[PDB]
Write an enzyme that holds these catalytic residues in place. Structure first.
Site, PDB file in Angstrom:
ATOM      1  CB  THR G   1      -7.943   0.584  -2.250  1.00  0.00           C
ATOM      2  OG1 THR G   1      -7.041   0.304  -1.744  1.00  0.00           O
ATOM      3  CG2 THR G   1      -8.361  -0.895  -2.925  1.00  0.00           C
ATOM      4  CB  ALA G  49      -2.737  -1.687   5.011  1.00  0.00           C
TER       5      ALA G  49
END
Ligand SMILES: [Mg+2]
Ligand SMILES: [Mg+2]
Lengths: 233, 195, 240, 231, 244, 222, 212, 204, 235
Positions: G1, G49
């Site tokens: 990410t 997530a």
């Protein structure tokens, strides 16, 4: 968190045209010690269901008491307890499956593998498996422990898929079960010669057979086997 | 959270706290003020575990401010330090302790004296002329043992403090991005904008 | 635990325990709130049957909830302390979580909610207290004045009074207070507050308390001499 | 008189007045009729409104695919008891993979209502219920009273002027019981039964409420234009 | 159920009064009079024992005057047993404060907390209130010498001189007459005893029917001393003022 | 020590069309190197035109599906028989999964159906409840074998228009139900060849506005 | 990410990638890592997530309840603190979150708060969070000025994610752009790295390390 | 990470002829780092003296706790607590935290105001009472103190002589311990007077 | 005394019936439902002229698509509104959608009977819950402390309710526009109110699908009041 102490080995079972067959030996092992020799591991519930249990025997006895109590509870305020509102195999299985999964979810399992064999009120064969993890599955043949590895292959040669069930008679099905029990006695170190066998038929009902023995065993060829390689004498 | 220093001079207490906030291999911020005003004449600097430091500092701040309103009266630095110590003393035997070390610099208006308290996360309290938490002390304490005098002015205390920061900037492995300096005296709390 | 429903409905649709709590407020010493153009003033009566008092240490009628909000009351004195404590705790809790001091409306809404909860909770009686809550919202120069009561209803007021003989002082404020043009200065607002209390109090010596609140946490309590000057000025203008 | 202050007190003649007062709430409630054959069970309910501007109060509640009831009295109490039934039906399905017997459903309601009549602080339920269902032993109709008494019946009615519909079903017993494999005719008998409890008012399109369950018929409610057929 | 037997101790009258608090105050009005007088250099506490018997052990007895800490003391008027419950709580609170802040508890803070406990019994719990009125005498470095009183309502107020218990109306009038602001401790001692001597329901005021205590800064240099008077010391101070 | 988790193998596959959606899964159930059942369904019709499969640890999978089916039932009771939209079902499942954040359901969940505009929808979940709407998703043991094939054939990834110097991409378009089923069958036969836990049978549930249809196909049994 | 957000003359730029990984397995390339809390509030997601997605949507519900109760849009500070105080309660339980709460209000102006799962809460002008945060910092810091135009600012945020997407193995897929002004937030599209890289390489003359 | 040897320090108590002595070092450190040279480890509640070694936060906490308890004792009993009684109170309080103990080595010292008998006592961290005629030792140089006391001590020493014995026992024990020293204090306790002396020692 | 959850001989709960009497003493609140929207209006009823009328909050937002008006012991409504707002937002969090007006009303009515010897007494306030959803469209509900809720085309509650309801009986028809409904609330409010109706002592509000729930300004309502007077004088 548990560990199993006194244990029972394989439970094997299969479907045939009119019903189901289930079998399990009469041994209660204590590790490598073959401690107890008169242990019944097939427990009938009513006249239409047989629950076969392997794994920890203390937990098996707990499950016996639960089933025994379930029959009592079902009979309360129930005029049709021996008829339309009698206990079905599917009811008995789902109850156990609920309990098995609840106990694993509390990290305190019943250390067992269970096969519920029976015939439903509409004549349909019932055969389903549940274990300490709450895992469930159904198949024309089901087996636990070593039975899964050695019995299933032999039983699946008779009933390899759903369409083979109507083609399989009670005589052929029982013969395959008895043959499988002999193979397990040859190759499972925690098995015994003595076993019980139960047939639940939609016509003839529940037939429970006790004190069966493995017979017609091949040992004669052992006399010719000498040494471990080069030794001739 | 790494470097927090404290120096009590004649008429004031000086707290110096590093501006760096580091997480992993990244300096996320270089202007972080590691202190909270507990009352007009009491200042607390802090260092330790991420999250716990600010959460603890603000919890103490709220309690002291609540006391101020209730009694219409400012608690003495000694009283505040004891309250803070007890909270840390409770914390160390909790399920999850506050891993936070603090310095409390305050000016007692009744005594007309500056006061500096050093308290670690275990609830270990000591009143000192100069103090530090973490690895900072291993350099500054010996330096202050030599150069510190009890009758020093605020300006002399700042020059002494500059000498500590220079030594840390020379010998410390990590880049702590300088310090924010604050002075606590009779007139209250003010920040030195050019350091 | 003690569970009894003490506050309950009667055949005529009244909750007597809440209405009897209002009677306790009516017995209490008079309190008045008047808001001007750039300030709010809280006036409070102190009964003069109590001499040999120590005014240094005796609990003041007007209480600071935060540095920018104040709370006066009429009714049971002991009951008021419980509301004031809860209010002060909530004020600091609000600063902690919202990183901003309470608005006057928010603080009033909290106090009013506490009062309401005690009208339909088991084993408790309603607060025998009505409050006047005044102050200035953060970074705002508009004066705020609210009122609460035992039932839990609350509302904003340009000027308002509570306590004993409050109907008389309310009558005075209703004709003397102009909405279109409120007290422009601090002096005008204080004078009107003192004038209103002089209709009821008795003497303007150590019976009247005055507290002035201004924007940006600027709160101060007037002394005896300062208040006495207003009393002296009003009486001389009255003789006409 | 002196023995009606709470549910924990017996009268000198052995009566429970709070239970009898709760029973009185049902008599004030709007009429609802229940009846069954061997294949189907039917509920018919007369809904009530506050005025012409208001909606009509819903009387029938679904409990499961094979069971449901109609209410008469305090509607919120019916919501509580029907919610309890929904949970018990659902417990039976999840744990035992078993549709809850209508007889057990009645036994469970009886025991839940009983506990409220023997303890201090609480109160009896102020509603009467007519439970219909189809299980492994065929069609069923139960009558629940908040005294705790639950009764299995061929047909019945509760609410204001329910005696008229009850007398009709007592006469029609031999006829409607044999309406097997014919939903519309069984409903018609129920609509004709509830009509015997009407005074001045008649059955309109947004007034009538009907429900049915049977052999190959899940519990379904009919309201609005769907009941225009039976007027 | 049990509802039938509930007296409902925490409710309002139609007039807006708390029944049980008013009736508790009526109980306290029959109790032995207790007086507190605050001077510029100390505080006096004087209290009248309730109809003493000749065989009562007077020297090893404590009915009226109790010590909360080294700087604070109370005079009791009402049920002695009720007072002792509250006194032990107050003693604990004072020590909790000292443990937390390493400073002796300010007088008002101790008074407020004890008065808040009393308030609780009038608003919730369904229990009877404590039938006790206190006079608090204490010193701290903020407000110096302080006198407070609390009653079963949980309301407390500060005083220069005050009486609780029996004949407070007559007692307060006499105190209001002779008290002045620049008064000394020795003068306050005399006023307290003179007031009790005139308001008492007994024939004559004697040493065995009294408890007495002072809080002076008479100790060596900037420190407070609590003096709970012994029987012989009360006998001496009673003769010295010319009452016996 | 007792290990509360297990691996029951198998693989699942969800694809969304223009006015339809499919959710496919093999019928083999395994533990270690043994076959438990050659036909044990794990793709279920949950009502309201929603199909669901929770592949991985079958006990957790059955528990989750059972709980979601129950959630749909109660949604009907509490909200006047309102139809549970696919997006609302997806959010509901997130809370079911995240409710056991610190003792997770060890499953990869996929649901399929139609959105409120009548268009094909597939939603995929991780074990702890993070979800995302996608045109395409494979889950389970053979996911790593099937998924890149789907990227190439469904979403036309790495495919450029011939002769355009790799400048113009191959245009995206909706696939027919016939073309999708071809890709599903070819995906599962390929997975059956190269993955030991995949085989025996393939069960596909197809969702259109008309309802839920089923299709079964044999797979290699070795 | 890789996520970033920076403050500048014309408000706030927010930029994120769209890759999701389970070990070395690329699970998804089309993940939404920006949450739209309200017309004036954005939240970025890095770490776990589910933790980020669940709790930041929960945060939106709490921000909505605030404006219902207080008849006023929540401040960026107050919004960020609800989240930071929430995760702090769970400290030690194993939440993994690296988030940035970005928004505009009248009293605060354009404001960015960094909030993570071990309780840290920081106000700041520039932040980069995630496995590729260092790569984004390198490009962002060297080209950042306060006097950037809205056009150049949007590009720098996009270019910074591209840089990280290239070098960081666990970052990629596409770039999602957002601009936050006094009037609220404005979406500036989804940009696939597959096409964006070659476009930037050609037009800018950068990325000479790669075989063109 | 051994609570008893993080901060360092020592306490020793001795009995003499109609007198007792209690002494301690002034060091408070954080392992190798010396932090404070003013940290006194001896406290008194009325005429009963208590020394505490070990974890400094617990030293402070227990002092505050026993001040708390002896103040309430005095108010209720209307008299100062005696050393024998206080010793039992310390034991009870420590054992109350049996499975979460204060990491300390307390030492009680004092003269009974009624009988006039000199009294000393020691405890382990969970309150086991060690009563002794001669001497009690505690802290990070307890081995050193046992050796010094055993050889130097003799019964019925006069206050002035006892001071020299206890001072030399502490000093020479402290100089053989890294975590002890940095100054020292000695209390000489007679029936109705108490002398406190700060000792000169090496500051390393 | 007597139990809180006691039945009368007629079969009604004493406390519930007594709470209905308290609601009759409350200020008037009127709601009218149309195909273009639902209008909610209330009598503010300031007890004194010094009371700032704009602080009287008897119309309240629950969500963007649901509004609420109250009458009776208005302080009791605060916890009901808090529960409603939480229920609405919570449902959106669980299901990523707006919550049905009926379901919201049902959730509020579940609190009603949760009293006894839970809270100590029933609520002393009635609520008009108005809103819009995709399934059943524009809706108006009347939530009572008995736990019962009726849907209404139009409804009046408070002191002038029986007179206003009779007026709503005649005036309401299925083809009413939003503007017509606004004037009709103002008209009926002016009739039953003690003091003379103006923008300061009366408040209007509405809920439409497009713009959601909105409380009208005093300037906007003042024009509708002026428009109302002219139309009545026109014939
Ligand atoms: Mg294969
Ligand atoms: Mg050294």
């Amino acid at each position: 968190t548990q560990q199993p102490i006194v244990t029972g080995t394989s439970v094997i079972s299969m479907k045939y045209d009119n019903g189901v067959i289930i079998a399990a030996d009469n041994l209660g092992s204590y590790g490598s010690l073959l401690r107890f020799n008169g242990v019944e591991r097939l427990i009938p519930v009513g006249d239409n269901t047989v629950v076969g249990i392997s794994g920890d025997i203390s937990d098996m006895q707990h499950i016996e008491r639960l089933l025994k109590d379930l029959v009592t509870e079902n009979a309360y305020d129930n005029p049709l307890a021996d008829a339309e509102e009698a206990l079905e195999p599917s009811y008995i299985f789902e109850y156990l499956a609920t309990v098995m999964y609840q106990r694993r979810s509390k990290m305190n399992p019943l250390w067992n593998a269970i096969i519920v064999a029976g015939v439903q009120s509409n004549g349909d064969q019932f055969l389903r498996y549940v274990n300490l993890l709450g895992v469930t599955y159904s198949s024309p043949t089901l087996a636990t422990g070593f039975g899964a590895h050695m019995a299933n292959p032999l039983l699946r040669k008779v009933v390899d898929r759903e369409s083979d069930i109507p083609k399989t008679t009670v005589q052929v099905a029982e013969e395959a079960i008895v043959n499988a029990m002999r193979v397990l006695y040859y190759r499972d170190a925690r098995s015994s010669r003595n076993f019980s066998l139960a047939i639940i038929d939609k016509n003839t009902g529940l037939t429970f057979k006790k004190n069966l023995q493995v017979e017609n065993m091949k040992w004669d060829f052992a006399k010719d086997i000498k040494g471990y390689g080069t030794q001739k004498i | 959270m790494d470097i927090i220093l404290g120096i009590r001079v004649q008429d004031s207490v000086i707290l110096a706290s590093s501006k760096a906030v580091t997480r992993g291999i990244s300096v996320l911020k270089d202007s972080d003020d590691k202190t909270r005003q507990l009352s007009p004449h009491t200042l607390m600097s802090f260092a330790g575990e991420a999250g716990d430091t600010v959460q603890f500092a603000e919890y103490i701040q709220a309690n002291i401010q609540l006391y101020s309103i209730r009694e219409d009266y400012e608690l003495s630095p000694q009283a505040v330090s004891s309250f803070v110590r007890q909270e840390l003393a409770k914390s160390i035997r909790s399920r999850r302790p506050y891993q936070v070390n603090v310095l409390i610099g305050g000016y007692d208006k009744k005594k007309n004296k500056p006061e500096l308290y050093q308290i670690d996360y275990l609830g270990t309290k000591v009143e000192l002329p100069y103090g530090a938490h973490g690895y900072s002390g291993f350099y500054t304490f010996s330096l202050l043992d030599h150069h510190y005098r009890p009758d020093m002015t605020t300006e002399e205390g700042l020059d002494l403090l500059k000498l500590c920061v220079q030594e840390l900037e020379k010998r410390m492995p990590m880049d702590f991005k300088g310090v924010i300096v604050k002075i606590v005296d009779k007139d209250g709390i003010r920040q030195v904008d050019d350091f | 635990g003690y569970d009894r429903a003490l506050s309950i409905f009667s055949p005529d649709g009244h909750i007597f325990q809440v209405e009897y709590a209002l009677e306790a407020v009516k017995r209490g010493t008079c309190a008045v709130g008047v808001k001007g153009k750039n300030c709010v003033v809280l006036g409070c009566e102190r009964r003069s049957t109590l001499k040999l008092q120590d005014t240094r240490i005796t609990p003041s009628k007007v209480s600071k909830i935060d540095s920018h909000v104040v709370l006066s009351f009429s009714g049971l004195n002991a009951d008021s302390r419980i509301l004031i404590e809860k209010a002060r705790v909530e004020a600091q809790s609000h600063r902690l979580t919202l990183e901003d001091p309470v608005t006057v409306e928010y603080l009033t809404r909290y106090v009013a909610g506490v009062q309401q909860r005690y009208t339909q909770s088991g084993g408790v009686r309603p607060f025998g207290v009505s409050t006047l809550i005044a102050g200035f919202d953060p970074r705002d120069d508009e004066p705020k004045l609210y009122q609460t009561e035992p039932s839990g209803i609350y509302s904003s007021w340009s000027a308002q009074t509570i306590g004993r003989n409050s109907k008389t002082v309310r009558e005075f404020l209703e004709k003397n207070y102009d909405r279109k043009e409120p007290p422009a200065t601090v002096e005008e607002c204080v004078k009107l507050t003192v004038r209103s209390l002089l209709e009821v109090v008795q003497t303007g010596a150590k019976n009247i308390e005055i507290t002035v609140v201004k924007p940006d946490s600027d709160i101060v309590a007037l002394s005896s001499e300062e208040i006495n000057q207003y009393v002296t000025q009003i009486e001389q203008e009255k003789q006409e | 008189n002196n023995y009606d202050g709470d549910t924990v007190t017996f009268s000198p003649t052995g009566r429970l007045f709070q239970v009898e007062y709760a029973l009185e709430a049902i008599k004030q409630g709007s009429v609802t009729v229940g009846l069954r054959s061997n294949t189907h069970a039917v509920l018919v309910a007369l809904k009530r409104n506050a005025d012409e501007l208001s909606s009509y109060q819903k009387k029938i509640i679904k409990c499961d695919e094979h069971m449901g009831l109609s209410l008469a009295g305090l509607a919120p109490d019916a919501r509580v008891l029907s919610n309890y039934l929904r949970q018990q039906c659902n417990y039976s399905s999840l744990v035992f993979n078993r549709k809850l017997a209508v007889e057990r459903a009645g036994h469970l309601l009886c025991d839940k209502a009983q506990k409220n009549t023997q303890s201090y602080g609480g109160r009896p339920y102020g509603v009467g219920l007519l439970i219909i269902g189809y299980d492994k032993s065929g069609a069923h109709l139960l009558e629940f009273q908040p005294s705790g008494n639950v009764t299995e019946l061929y047909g019945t009615a509760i609410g204001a002027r329910s005696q008229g519909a009850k007398t009709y079903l007592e006469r029609t017993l031999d006829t409607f019981i044999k309406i097997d494999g014919n939903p519309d005719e069984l409903i018609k008998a129920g609509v004709e039964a509830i009509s015997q409890s009407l005074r001045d008012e008649s059955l309109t399109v947004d007034n009538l409420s009907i429900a049915i369950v049977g052999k190959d018929t899940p519990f379904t409610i009919y309201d609005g234009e769907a009941v225009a057929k039976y007027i | 159920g049990s509802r039938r037997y509930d007296s409902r101790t925490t409710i309002f009258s139609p007039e807006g009064r708390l029944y049980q608090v008013e009736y508790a105050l009526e109980s306290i009005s029959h109790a032995g009079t207790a007086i507190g007088i605050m001077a510029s250099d100390g505080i006096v506490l004087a209290a009248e024992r309730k109809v003493t018997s000749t065989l009562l052990e007077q020297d090893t007895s404590t009915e009226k005057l109790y010590k909360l800490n080294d700087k604070i003391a109370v005079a009791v008027a009402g049920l002695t047993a009720d007072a002792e419950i509250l006194i032990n709580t107050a003693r604990i609170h004072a020590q909790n404060y000292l443990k937390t802040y390493n400073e002796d508890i300010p007088v008002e803070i101790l008074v407020r907390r004890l008065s808040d406990i009393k308030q609780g019994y009038t608003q919730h719990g369904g229990l009877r209130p404590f039938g006790v009125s206190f006079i608090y005498a204490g010193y701290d470095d903020r407000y110096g010498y302080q006198l407070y009183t609390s009653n079963p309502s949980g309301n407390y107020t500060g005083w220069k001189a005050i009486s609780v218990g029996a004949n407070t109306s007559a007692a307060q009038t006499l105190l209001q007459m002779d008290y002045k602001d620049d008064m000394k401790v020795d003068d306050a001692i005399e006023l307290a005893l003179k007031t009790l001597s005139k308001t008492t329901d007994s024939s004559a005021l004697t040493y065995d029917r009294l408890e007495f205590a002072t809080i002076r800064k008479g100790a060596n240099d900037g420190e407070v001393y609590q003096k709970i008077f012994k029987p012989q010391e009360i006998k001496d101070i009673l003769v010295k003022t010319g009452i016996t | 020590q007792f290990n509360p988790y297990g691996d029951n193998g198998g693989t699942i596959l969800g694809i969304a069309g223009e006015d339809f959606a499919v959710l496919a899964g093999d019928t083999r159930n395994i533990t270690d190197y043994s076959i438990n059942s050659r036909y044990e369904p794990k793709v279920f019709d949950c009502g309201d035109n929603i199909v669901m499969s929770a592949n991985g640890f079958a006990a957790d999978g059955d528990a989750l599906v059972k709980r979601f089916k129950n959630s749909v039932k109660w949604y009907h009771f509490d909200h006047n028989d309102k139809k549970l939209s696919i997006n609302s079902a997806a959010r509901n499942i997130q809370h079911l999964l995240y409710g056991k954040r610190f003792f997770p359901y060890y499953v990869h969940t996929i649901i399929a159906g139609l959105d409120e505009d009548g268009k094909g929808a597939v939603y995929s979940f991780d074990p702890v409840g993070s979800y995302e709407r996608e045109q395409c998703r494979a889950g389970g043991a053979a996911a790593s074998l099937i998924m890149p094939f789907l990227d190439n054939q469904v979403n036309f990834k790495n495919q450029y228009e011939p002769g355009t110097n790799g400048k113009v991409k191959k245009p995206l378009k909706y696939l027919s139900v016939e073309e999708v089923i071809k890709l599903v069958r070819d995906s599962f036969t390929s997975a059956t060849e190269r993955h030991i836990q995949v085989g025996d049978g393939l069960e596909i549930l197809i969702v259109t506005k008309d309802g839920v249809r089923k299709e079964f196909y044999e797979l290699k049994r070795d | 990410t890789t996520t970033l957000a920076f403050r500048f003359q014309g408000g706030i730029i927010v930029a994120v990638d769209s890759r999701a990984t389970a070990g070395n397995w690329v699970a998804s390339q089309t993940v939404k890592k920006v949450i739209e809390i309200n017309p004036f509030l954005l939240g970025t997601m890095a770490g776990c997530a589910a933790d980020c997605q669940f709790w930041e949507t929960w945060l939106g519900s709490q921000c909505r309840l605030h404006e219902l109760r207080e008849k006023e849009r929540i401040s960026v500070a107050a919004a960020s603190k609800i989240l930071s105080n929430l995760v702090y309660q769970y400290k030690g339980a194993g939440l993994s979150m690296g988030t940035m709460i970005c928004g505009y209000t009248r009293k605060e102006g354009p404001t960015i708060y960094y909030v993570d799962s071990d309780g840290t809460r920081l106000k700041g002008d520039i932040f980069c969070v995630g496995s590729g945060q260092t790569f984004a910092y390198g490009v962002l810091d060297s080209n950042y000025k306060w006097d950037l135009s809205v056009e150049d600012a949007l590009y720098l945020g996009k270019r910074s994610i591209l840089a990280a997407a290239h070098r960081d193995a666990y970052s990629g897929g596409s770039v999602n752009l957002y601009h936050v002004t006094e009037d609220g937030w404005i979406y500036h599209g989804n940009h696939d790295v597959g096409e964006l890289f070659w476009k930037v390489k050609e037009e800018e003359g950068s990325f000479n390390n790669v075989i063109g | 990470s051994d609570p008893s040897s993080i901060n360092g320090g020592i306490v020793v108590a001795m009995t003499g002829k109609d007198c007792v002595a209690i002494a301690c070092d002034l060091r408070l450190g954080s392992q190798s780092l010396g932090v404070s040279n003013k940290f006194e480890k001896i406290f008194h509640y009325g005429h009963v003296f208590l020394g505490i070694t070990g974890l400094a936060t617990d030293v402070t906490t227990l002092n505050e706790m026993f001040r708390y308890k002896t103040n309430l004792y005095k108010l209720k009993e209307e008299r100062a607590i005696e050393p024998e009684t206080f010793t039992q109170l310390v034991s009870s309080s420590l054992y109350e935290r049996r499975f979460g103990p204060y990491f300390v080595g307390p030492v009680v010292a004092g003269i009974n105001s009624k009988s006039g008998k000199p009294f000393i006592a020691g405890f382990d961290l969970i309150g086991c009472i060690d009563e002794a005629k001669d001497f009690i030792v505690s802290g990070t140089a307890s081995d050193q103190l046992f050796g010094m006391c055993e050889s130097l001590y003799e019964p019925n020493l006069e206050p002035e002589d006892l001071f020299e014995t206890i001072s030399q026992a502490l000093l020479n024990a402290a100089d053989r311990d890294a975590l002890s020293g940095w100054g020292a204090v000695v209390y000489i306790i007679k029936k109705d007077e108490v002398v406190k002396r700060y000792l000169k020692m090496r500051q390393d | 005394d007597r139990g809180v959850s006691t039945f009368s001989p007629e079969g009604r709960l004493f406390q519930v019936e007594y709470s209905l009497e308290a609601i009759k003493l409350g200020s008037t609140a009127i709601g009218i439902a149309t195909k273009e929207g639902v209008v909610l209006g209330v009598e503010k009823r300031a007890t004194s002229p010094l009371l700032e009328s704009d602080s009287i909050e008897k119309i309240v937002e629950i969500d963007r698509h649901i509004g609420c008006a109250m009458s009776g012991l208005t302080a009791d409504a605060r916890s009901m509104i808090e529960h409603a707002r939480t229920a609405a937002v919570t449902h959106n969090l669980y299901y990523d959608e707006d919550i049905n007006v009926e379901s919201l009303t049902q959730s509020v009515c579940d609190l009603a009977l949760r009293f006894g010897e839970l809270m100590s007494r029933p609520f002393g306030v009635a609520l008009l819950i108005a809103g819009h959803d995709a399934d059943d469209g524009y809706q108006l509900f009347h939530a009572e402390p008995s736990g019962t809720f009726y849907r209404y085309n139009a409804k009046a509650i408070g002191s002038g309710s029986e007179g206003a309801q009779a007026e709503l009986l005649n005036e309401w028809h299925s083809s009413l526009t939003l503007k017509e409904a606004e004037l009709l609330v103002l008209k009926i409010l002016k009739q039953v109110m003690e003091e003379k109706l103006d923008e300061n002592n009366a408040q209007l509000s509405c809920i439409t699908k497009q713009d959601g729930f909105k409380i009208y300004d005093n300037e906007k309502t003042a024009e509708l009041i002026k428009e109302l007077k002219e139309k009545e004088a026109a014939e």
